[PDB]
Structures are given as structure tokens and as C-alpha cells.
Amino acid sequence: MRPYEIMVILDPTLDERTVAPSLETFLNVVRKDGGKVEKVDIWGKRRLAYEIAKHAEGIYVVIDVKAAPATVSELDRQLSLNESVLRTKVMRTDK
């Protein structure tokens, strides 16, 4: 039960409407074990500063969970192993 800020860089090939349920199907496993989500903000398409995974564009997502370390590690696992993500960056907002 600790704060976590997660930025995820998704492929620009998928659309702006199907991004939210595609992330709900990941965050529900975070929800099943007591962890909750505060803000699932989506910055959308954005040009990224150096070529990443054969894409020069990327969808920015900020996840902002409050969850156990095991659950956040599992979430990072799952969304890093999916084919719809180019980057993941997990941090803690708390001290």
C-alpha cells in the first residue's frame, strides 16, 4: 500500500478511443488485490525525442496507483510484456 507514479509509452498505431479499456483490463488485476488507482491520465499522441522500438511517436499514459509493491511489480511485468507498449517507468511519489 504505497504511492506509485507510472508512465507508459504505448504504440501510436492504436486509436485514442480503445486505449482506456485496454488499460482497464490491466488495472483490474491491480484492483483485485486491494490496490486502487487515482488518475489514469492519457496525454495521447506525442513525439518522442529519440527513436524507440521502430516508432518515432508514442502515447503517453500516467497511471498513479496506490498499491503494494508486489502488485505494482506484477502490473509493470504485464504491461511490459504486452505488445502495445514501448516504454515503462515506475516511480514512487512518496518519500
Binding site: I9, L48, A49, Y50, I52, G58, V62, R87, K89
Partner: protein, 64 residues
């Protein structure tokens, strides 16, 4: 004279790439304390922010 020492509750996060635009040279080099006028802890914070921005591609690793 350090900007963040003067101005409070401005947490340094790699998300604020707009603020991180400065403290970075046009080449992409992290500026030194003698050129940013800022303290050791805030220079640590901005350096960490710049590096995480680089690894999330919010800031260039190499640029001209």
C-alpha cells in the same frame, strides 16, 4: 539565489519537461551548478529528473 530555494512547493519531476528545458544545454548537456546558480540537493534533483526524462524520451539523450 537558488531558484527552488527561493520558490517553495515546486517539486522537481521529469514530467515538467518544460521546466527541464533549461538546466540542459542546446547540445543536451546537463549544466553545472556554477552556471545554474542552484544548490547541491536541487542540482541532484534536476539531474535525476533530466536522466529519467531522457530514459522516457521526454528529453534527448543526444541532440544538436
Amino acid at each position: 539565489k537558488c531558484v527552488f530555494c527561493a520558490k517553495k512547493d515546486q517539486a522537481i519531476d521529469y514530467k515538467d519537461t518544460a521546466l527541464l528545458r533549461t538546466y540542459i544545454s542546446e547540445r543536451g548537456k546537463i549544466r553545472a551548478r556554477r552556471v545554474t546558480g542552484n544548490c547541491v540537493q536541487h542540482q541532484r534533483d534536476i539531474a535525476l529528473a533530466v536522466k529519467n526524462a531522457r530514459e522516457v524520451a521526454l528529453l534527448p539523450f543526444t541532440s544538436s
